Amino acid sequence: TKQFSVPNLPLNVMSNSRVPSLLNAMVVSPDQAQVVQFQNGRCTLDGQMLGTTTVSASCVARFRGKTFQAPDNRLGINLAEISGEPYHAFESPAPLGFPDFGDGDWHVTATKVTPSQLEANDPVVVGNVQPYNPQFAPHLGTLVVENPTPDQVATGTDLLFNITWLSNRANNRFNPWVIPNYGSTLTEAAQLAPSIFPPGFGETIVYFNSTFPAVGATTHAAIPCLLPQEFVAHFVNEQAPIRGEAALLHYIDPDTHRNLGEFKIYPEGFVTCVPNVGGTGPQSLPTNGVFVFVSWVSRYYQLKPVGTAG
Amino acid sequence: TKQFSVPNLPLNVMSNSRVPSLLNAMVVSPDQAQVVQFQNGRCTLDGQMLGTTTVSASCVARFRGKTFQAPDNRLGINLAEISGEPYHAFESPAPLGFPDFGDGDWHVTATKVTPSQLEANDPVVVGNVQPYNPQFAPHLGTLVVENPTPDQVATGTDLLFNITWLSNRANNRFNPWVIPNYGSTLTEAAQLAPSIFPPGFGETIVYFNSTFPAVGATTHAAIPCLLPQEFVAHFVNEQAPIRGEAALLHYIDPDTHRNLGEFKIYPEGFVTCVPNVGGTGPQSLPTNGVFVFVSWVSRYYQLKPVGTAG
Ligand SMILES: [Mg+2]
Ligand SMILES: [Mg+2]
């Protein structure tokens, strides 16, 4: 009897579910239909998180671990959960909130997190992680920070990492759709979030974009996700049972209360629309509108085209 | 008719409202009754944000601005909203989410956020901000980054700042209770969030702590706030009208479903308890509990003592 709903927050005050950044656009990208299989920002409408998705905004694209010495003054990290609690293999693709970009270097800023180690001195370690590296092994709980500054960190130092920025590999552009390779030890419990395939009825997936310091990107500094983090947090909180084949949303201009566009959000946890032919679809709408639940609908409910025709 | 409620997320998956960090403790601190007047994490039960509080988790203690050249290779920043929207004086204490730590140096890591400036090259600028500096003028929209690296940043470059860590002033310890001096030009619309005075009936204010890289702190690397960010996001979303003098919450083991403690959350937007005398109050309780609304109550409802005797 718990009815379903979405947070009624304006889009442009909601946040990405794959980087800790404000949302400032929504787009569609039908043509370049490469695999859609993000591991963060994944949640069912009844509030089950998938892949590495956490409910915790402050964990999105953060990783934590203890240091050990690797060959050639590389700084090995034994991952734990950001909460500090241990990370064990064979249960999830990677720790909760672990970043899901596989196509470029991560330039990272870490601090120490042990209170005893925080009463004096500089707590910062900086470096970069290469998800294409052979020693990148997040499912089994270990990765390698190339080029650490400082060059020598004591073993067993507890470090919390942020992604300061992302950069392309040499002579490629950084594709933020591409998820990492988590390892080859994939148990059924630890399975990746499934890929999402195009929905039919002339619908196309809607991505919520963020401007983010992603250098040399295929998208010009824009990180897409399928769900605002606030939606994830909302579904996990509400646990509203699924009572239909999809959920029709209206994107409302909040003051004038007029309908700016029709969307469907599917039980698997992704949004779609029908773009007005030959136009940008939802991207031309004001980013200060609000999403409201209208009703459950069937998969074949036909959406009115959204946007202008170019 | 919209009934009041709190997010029913376990405390240790919710986040700080004054730094972007996971919560990992709740404490009381009666005796050292320094003024309680945080500007972030302030929100009424019917969802009116106060001081500099934003709803956007990814804006908590982040600031944005455009560079100009100040004397002696200092880096001046003309503040804007993190969204990019211009910041004007006389309306708010400071931009939304602006950090409210006055008692220590902020060591900051910024990136360029202009997409054209992110097709190539390193986009990082680091430095430190000194709230006690005479050029620290956040209400009027300007501050200075001391010791920038790089030393010369082109004028008018758009930079998004994070606080990597906080450090004490020399010969002092860093008190995270201390809010900045925002300026002298403080109009009525731009008034600070009021300070909170202890509530009577043997009650004391409950603080939600995070471990955070705050070096040399008076609290051993712990940042307190009055409300989890998720609460703020919840009250703003719900807009449930105030229908009593206080709201009684139970803190529930979400397994056993048993009552771990009684709390009141007041309309002005803070939580209290009655510590069992001679103990830490709520600090001994497990941190995986969940808050649930029971009923509105009057101010003189007497809470059962929380915690052990010590
Ligand atoms: Mg899992
Ligand atoms: Mg204001």
Residue numbers in the entry:
A (entry chain B), B (entry chain A): 231 to 540
What does the paper say about this structure?
However, the molecular interactions between host antigens and the GI.9 capsid protein have not been investigated in detail.
